[PDB]
Amino acid sequence: KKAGSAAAPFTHDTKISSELQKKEYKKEDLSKINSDFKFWLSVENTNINYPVVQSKDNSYYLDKDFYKKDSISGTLFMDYRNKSIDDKNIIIYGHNMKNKTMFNNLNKFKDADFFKKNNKIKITLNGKEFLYDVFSAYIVESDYDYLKTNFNNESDYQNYINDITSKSLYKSPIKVNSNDKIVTLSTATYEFDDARMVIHGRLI
Amino acid sequence: KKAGSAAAPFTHDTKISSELQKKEYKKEDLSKINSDFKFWLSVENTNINYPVVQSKDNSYYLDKDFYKKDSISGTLFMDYRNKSIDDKNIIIYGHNMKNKTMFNNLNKFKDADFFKKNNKIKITLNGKEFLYDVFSAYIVESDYDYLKTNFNNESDYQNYINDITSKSLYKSPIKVNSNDKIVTLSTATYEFDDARMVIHGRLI
């Protein structure tokens, strides 16, 4: 009946994802299933609990599953510019799906209270967990690209931080400086989307 | 470089779509390529100029090209409920793509000045061209399901008309009533889109 409500495509990704959640919990090595795998990602009080891959660009995995087959949800993925631990800003992209999956829940950070509750973003890499507090959340337009992974100096990075901080829908009691590391979570799509969600966390 | 801007998947759909424009101009029979083919759709002062198909639901052709292959743009398709030439409302669905293809240009109707230009919708079927005047246009939440192909009586139909007329961002000269036939063009997607375009024309 409803346009784009058919079950089989969501079932595909739902089945793949949950199976991977199990495998991750048992500490199986997911990079033996896709060498593109980098780390696991979760966010407190969301359903965001997924693997993150990376490829040559910022598109391949939007409509591809963890086994590289076509899929409407895709797999979360790190920006292709990211290289290492040391990067100042880790950027991760995902669909906003209609059964409220992938990065859909990023929308919760629009609630004033949820945002004050200070839910953490969590990255798990080779059995070591890294935590980030959200200091900035906002909504951007289809072709928003103010998303930088690396910087020439302490000063450029500070300016980027001042900028993305001033953009926040809500003021956070966390000042970030040029010695911090940050994470950026972004909605992304091949379709036109003027309501894209952008979240920034600070490494605790 | 930028998230979801990889050329290749768009190239796939541009190639197909412009070949089919050439085939339709030549008056080739497109139902020999795909049985599901129904008619041709264009809209004045837009790049909307595509083939319309129908499956047995409202999802299959969202991410399938006219050769029933995976594609990020899909193929414009008619609501499965439209069975007859005497249906009171014909309803067609399409993607709002980032490269401004498919039903992107429905968004042009958000402009008061494009709206009052009376740009007509065009259905070409078996040689015969059928023309419609756009009398309502608006934005709807991801959920919107107030899309009805048929009605039990002229009172039910008039109420439907009255309602969708009230939603228009703009008032139109054109009065619609329960003896009219109408077309409905809706943006649609597997993702969450609280900014999707619905427009309605009236058969001339």
Residue numbers in the entry:
A (entry chain B), B (entry chain A): 39 to 242
Copy text verbatim from the article accompanying this structure deposition:
Despite extensive attempts, it was not possible to crystallise wild type C. difficile SrtB, either under the optimal condition for SrtB C226A or any other condition tested in high throughput screening. High throughput crystallisation screening with both SrtB and SrtB C226A yielded small crystals in one condition with SrtB C226A, consisting of 0.1 M Phosphate/Citrate buffer pH 4.2, 40% PEG300. The crystal structure of C. difficile SrtB C226A reveals a fold that is characteristic of the class B sortases, consisting of an eight stranded discontinuous beta barrel, decorated on its surface by several alpha and 310 helices. As is observed in other class B sortases, the N-terminal region of C. difficile SrtB C226A forms two helices (H1 and H2) arranged in a ‘V' shape pointing away from the active site side of the enzyme. No metal ions were observed in the β6/β7 loop known to participate in Ca2+ ion binding in S. aureus SrtA. This is not surprising given that the loop is devoid of the triad of glutamine residues which co-ordinate metal binding in S. aureus SrtA. A modelled active site was therefore constructed by reversing the mutation in-silico and adjusting the side chain torsion angles to match those of the analogous residues in the S. aureus and B. anthracis SrtB enzymes. The cysteine and arginine residues are found in a deep depression on the surface of the enzyme, while His133 is shielded from the depression by the side chain of tyrosine residue 227 within the β7/β8 loop. The β6/β7 loop of the C. difficile SrtB C226A contains an identical pairing of tyrosine and leucine, suggesting that the ‘SP' portion of the C. difficile sorting signal may be recognised in a similar manner.
